[PDB]
Amino acid sequence: APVRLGGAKVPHLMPGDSLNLQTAQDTDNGYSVFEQSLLRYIAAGLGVSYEQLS
Amino acid sequence: HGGGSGFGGQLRSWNPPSESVDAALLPNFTRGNARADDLVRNNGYAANAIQLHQDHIVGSFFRLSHRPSWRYLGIGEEEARAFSREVEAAWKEFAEDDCCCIDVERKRTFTMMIREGVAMHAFNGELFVQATWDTSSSRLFRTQFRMVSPKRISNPNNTGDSRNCRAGVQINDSGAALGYYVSEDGYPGWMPQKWTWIPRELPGGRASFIHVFEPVEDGQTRGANVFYSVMEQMKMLDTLQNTQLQSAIVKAMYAATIESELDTQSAMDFILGANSQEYAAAPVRLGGAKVPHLMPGDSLNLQTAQDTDNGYSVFEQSLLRYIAAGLGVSYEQLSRNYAQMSYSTARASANESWAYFMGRRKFVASRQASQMFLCWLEEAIVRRVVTLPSKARFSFQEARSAWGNCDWIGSGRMAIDGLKEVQEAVMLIEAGLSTYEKECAKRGDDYQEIFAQQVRETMERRAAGLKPPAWAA
Amino acid sequence: YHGGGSGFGGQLRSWNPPSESVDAALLPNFTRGNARADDLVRNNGYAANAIQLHQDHIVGSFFRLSHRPSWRYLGIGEEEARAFSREVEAAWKEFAEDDCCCIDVERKRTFTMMIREGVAMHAFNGELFVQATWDTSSSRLFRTQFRMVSPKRISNPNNTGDSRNCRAGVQINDSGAALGYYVSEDGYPGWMPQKWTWIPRELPGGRASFIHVFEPVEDGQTRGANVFYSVMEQMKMLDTLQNTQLQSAIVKAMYAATIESELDTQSAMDFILGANSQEQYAAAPVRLGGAKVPHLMPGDSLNLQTAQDTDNGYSVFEQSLLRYIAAGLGVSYEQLSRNYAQMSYSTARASANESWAYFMGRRKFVASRQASQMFLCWLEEAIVRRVVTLPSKARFSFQEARSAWGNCDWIGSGRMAIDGLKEVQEAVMLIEAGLSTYEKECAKRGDDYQEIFAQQVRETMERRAAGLKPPAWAA
Amino acid sequence: HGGGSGFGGQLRSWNPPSESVDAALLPNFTRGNARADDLVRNNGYAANAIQLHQDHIVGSFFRLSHRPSWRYLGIGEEEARAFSREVEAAWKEFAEDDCCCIDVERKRTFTMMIREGVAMHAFNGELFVQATWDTSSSRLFRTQFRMVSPKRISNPNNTGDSRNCRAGVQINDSGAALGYYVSEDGYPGWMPQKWTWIPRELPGGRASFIHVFEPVEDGQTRGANVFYSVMEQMKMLDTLQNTQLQSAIVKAMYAATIESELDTQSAMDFILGANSQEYAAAPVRLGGAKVPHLMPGDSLNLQTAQDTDNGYSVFEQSLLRYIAAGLGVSYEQLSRNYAQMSYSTARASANESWAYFMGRRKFVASRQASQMFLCWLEEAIVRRVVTLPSKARFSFQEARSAWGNCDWIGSGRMAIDGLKEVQEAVMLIEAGLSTYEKECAKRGDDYQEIFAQQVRETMERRAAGLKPPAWAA
Amino acid sequence: RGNARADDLVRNNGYAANAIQLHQDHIVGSFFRLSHRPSWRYLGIGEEEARAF
């Protein structure tokens, strides 16, 4: 079943129910910084300056 | 390689059905433009977006300069510029007339015609202007121009689409348009909608109906509004904005809470002050610190709530930037956010957007206005309003584009600094590289009357006998 | 395309807005929209400030006419027209900014106020209605007077429906041009009925009986739309959020502490708070002394709740919304929000010019038209009374050359400089380079070169008569 | 679309009762001014805001310069100059009269009456002043004045408001005011308040009573205070400041707690030193460490309390900006917070507020002063204070506006820097762009007497013989 | 298939639409003026005819 997007719609879940919201995690937990190291390394291979490449 | 399947399957089931843009958008073209009206008339950003277009590619005024092909006609520039003078004044008199006589609706002036058209073109993909010939002989010029909403053009009687008629647009084998089936107004839904076929061009040669747009690829008919790339995101952004604001309300609203086995009315009396001593449960005065004496067993709680903006502003940043890319307009102009910007960088943002705007001005504003202009010339010359030189190698209809070759002046690029901007402009003509004509066109005026006005001032000041201005002898 | 139809996996499958003209999309509940807009500008601080920004910047304080007839097109030497225009300007000057206050029928405002009134109501109601009339009493030299009319006044008679020609009290021909208007009289007492009245748009002689000005978005639109109509819901939602959050902090900071005694309230507060020694429900107020360390038995506790932050991200969230607000109203954000912090000179200069340019386009498309509309109507009577004589050798008469005779432009409050010294440096050097004229410079400063020159020569000989020193303009 | 119902209902029950401005203002008109007086009399921000007006709208003085329409009246140039200075001298002598007898109350001078005018128009939305002619001719001018509070102007006997009698304002058919019903002071509530009908205009061509206010739209009869968009929120702000202050007291007031089965009095002696040797419980001397010897079952818990400004400060200026938005005043002036302000940022905010003040001066301060001016001038001519030119095309009553045309000079813009302001001023005038009158008026002075004073200066110096000043030859 | 996917991105994505818009506005700009420079030396023609022509 689909659900229509609307207001807050606070529910009245019975005892023994739960409405856990998954907080997930930082989508870029260092990945950008890790690319910085890799991009510099690959820049050395191609000789072209890293900032031009990235 | 990349187009085949994608790494690890991934896009195993993404098979866009390659087809012409005509087949791409015509089935939902009316449906698409309907959503365009909604966003432009209900979201602030869209309203700002179109507003920014009107005030840049058009601006407050839209001046005209006529450049007939005297060399291509073999006419001396002396009489050529002599001839081009009065018509400009004649057009100027006919252009900014207060009566709004140039439109049948009699509720708009020439400048806003372009402004609405480019706006109409912006948020709908195209614009339509229809030429008329009113019978009111009192006016020297007996023609008027009115725009038409694109939704007013469609197949008569909702006819299924065919090769030569598409959305009520008559097209020949080659691809040119010939006629338009346009419906009338439909504000009262009680009466049925009739239809009217209008030829694109009068067989005589005078323009009857002008449709201006930009075809992305060849053989198409209707221009698609710019929002077709950002419609999905922008609408959901608004919904998120409203929902996020609503959540803050309710979460902040329920501030405290109290629990007890005691009576509900009694609890407020002994905890939250209450006024039951004298439907709505109990109003409570706001006074001092008002420390209670909750009995052991019950308690009072103050909800800590939650951060009202848990990075939501950052999410707006990215989403607005995405929207700005689709719209072409710079981000800081769209969101009116100018944080942590250097002068050099601030120039670049406006620098590229201005280049984008000037492209649209030539390709939309200039074309439609010039297409409007020569039609007015046609009436003027046939009504003997102005006189052509005797040396004319060709007839007016023969060299109509050559005769009516004209360029337009819009509102100038207001400088972020100006002082350097004027300084560089001054030293440029000092270097002799530039000319008065283009620099004043950049600012928003024409050198000719500027020279006359300066001539006007210097004689007046010398007549006034105070001091000659900075142009003497 | 693809985004038009159904989007990403159903997504906006329920978004199928109807397609129709703006009149069909605005007229049905058009009255309610004005009511919503009216309340916001009446009660929300930002909205009142927003419209105030329009009034004080689109026109500002003064509004000066400049009549520049097309002498070449009129078959008249500019020397006659220049002399002629000077006469009419003073007569207009004698008529427009006069302390007579008789420009309006109710005699309450002055000319500059009329435009300021008009632009404001046009801003938050979409359009302006001004009535042009005549005075039977020849007491005044000019019998014409004006009267602004609320757009709410303009309405269909007997609150009936609308036809192909009848639309919200406006009668239109096939082309949609307005010809007839219906105005109901004021109904301030809540009992007596309102009475309508049909008014022609213009008199057959070319006189504008009733002037209506707005900015339609598409052909056929009869009534303009208020600028708020895109962002009104945010204001109300922002309004309640501000009040609720402010209210919430009151209660969160209300109850500072609590006591967990087993005894009665009186005994508890006496032994934990103090008070007592009563002089003669009301519980007991406690003197605010110092420290007052109490003693406790087991089973009783004095707990001071820490509450929570009163601005836990509220301001920044509002900071975002106000940015969205300024986009809808087309005004510089920091100006609307009065939040002029953390921006450099370039950044500050960027926003200010951007909005100011929007005002200038708005000023030309509204203020210039409305002032000119009134000016020609007054001019009609002015020459009818022949207070100023038209040039004898005119190629055309006045009636056909209405715009040519009445060709005029207007100047309001100038672009007040952010820096000043830089800006004055601009004008002086470009004039030294000869890239502009005194007219533009004076107009950009909200002035006219004529009297400035007249004052300049006047101040010259005055000191010269005083024998003090020749100013920087001699011989 | 947006105005219909709202997304997800939302504003499904927001239905303002569309009405005329008076139809909403009049029913609660007294209550509006009631709360306005309370806020200005009790709230510092309200007091500061109002105080910010009379010293900026008009400053500490109000110069007058009468400019008759000599060209329109066809009068000689210098003759008009001769007339203007005589009446100016006559006016200025009477305007700042140290008698304080200009007003019947004899408790205010002309300048502060103008300040009284603008301030009253600020927090009450309107301005009143009664023109009277005194019988006692002890002095040259019999025309006194008295501003009347709006609270003294209302419908007589609290009768039902009518079509032509709204809020004690006699209204003609066209909507213009004809007369007013003024109630005398009712300082003791024991006695009733009678009513006097005052004509708006004396039949002789004299403004018997002068009412100044700004109408939002047509049909207005009274003026709405600027606070109308700011009352409730700032009142809730007012109690919040008090409420947190009291809460901060008690939270910081209670410091330590003692629990022990021992008798409380002995607990104080054994633990907190006490003075048991010599009801106010038991005081404690303030000395050194006072390390105790708590037995098992006892403790000396110290209350860490809680931060006294947990976001309250940063919550303030967010509201105060909203407050300052309502009153139009710049935020930093109202809040007296001036941090994080660069030179350009300071320039902009002061500039923005300044223009609005200049507008407010023109529409209120100049209006009231002009109305006071010609009324006095009317007495001046009838008393032959100044002799009119013979060749007057029309008499004074016919050309009151022409005779009485004038401007006013308030206090100047307090320059933040001054140097460049003077530096731009000197380069502006030398360029010929401006005139000496302009800037000195912007400074707040008149060019005429400065020329005379400098002329006085140079001859005084020459007589003393020290050095020719910078005006010689 | 490749053009089909390539078409869709420029047809329904803001960034892609921005890219091609940047292409047109920068690669060619608003005006595309032409000059004719025949090689009169190779043509063995007097330059005066060539530039006049």
Question: What is this structure's SSE topology?
Answer:
The structure is cut from a larger assembly and holds five copies of chain A.
Chain A lengths: L30 H16 L3 H4 L1
PDB class: viral protein/dna
Keywords: Bacteriophage, caudovirales, siphoviridae, portal vertex, portal, capsid, connector/neck, tail, delivery device, B-DNA, viral protein-DNA complex
Entry title: Mature virion portal of phage lambda with DNA
Question: Care to describe what's here?
Answer:
- Chain A: Homododecamer. Interacts with the terminase complex composed of two small and one large terminase subunits.
- The structure is cut from a larger assembly and holds 5 copies of chain A.
- Chain A contains 2 helices and no strands.
- Chains in contact: A-B, B-C, B-D, B-E, C-D, C-E.
- Strand 10 of chain C pairs parallel with strand 9 of chain D.
The 3D shape of chain A can be described as rod-shaped
| Secondary-structure content class of chain A | mainly alpha
Largest sheet of chain A: none
CA distance, first residue to last residue of chain A: 45 Å
Strand content range of chain A = under 5%
Q: Which assembly state applies to the chains in this document?
A: part of a larger assembly
Give Rg of chain A in angstroms: 23 Å
Most residues in contact: chain pair = B-C, 143 and 144 residues
SSE sequence of chain A, one letter per element: HH
Number of separate helices of chain A:
2
Proportion in helices of chain A: 25-40%
β-strand number of chain A? 0
PDB class: viral protein/dna
Keywords: Bacteriophage, caudovirales, siphoviridae, portal vertex, portal, capsid, connector/neck, tail, delivery device, B-DNA, viral protein-DNA complex
Entry title: Mature virion portal of phage lambda with DNA
Chains A, B, C, D, E: Portal protein B
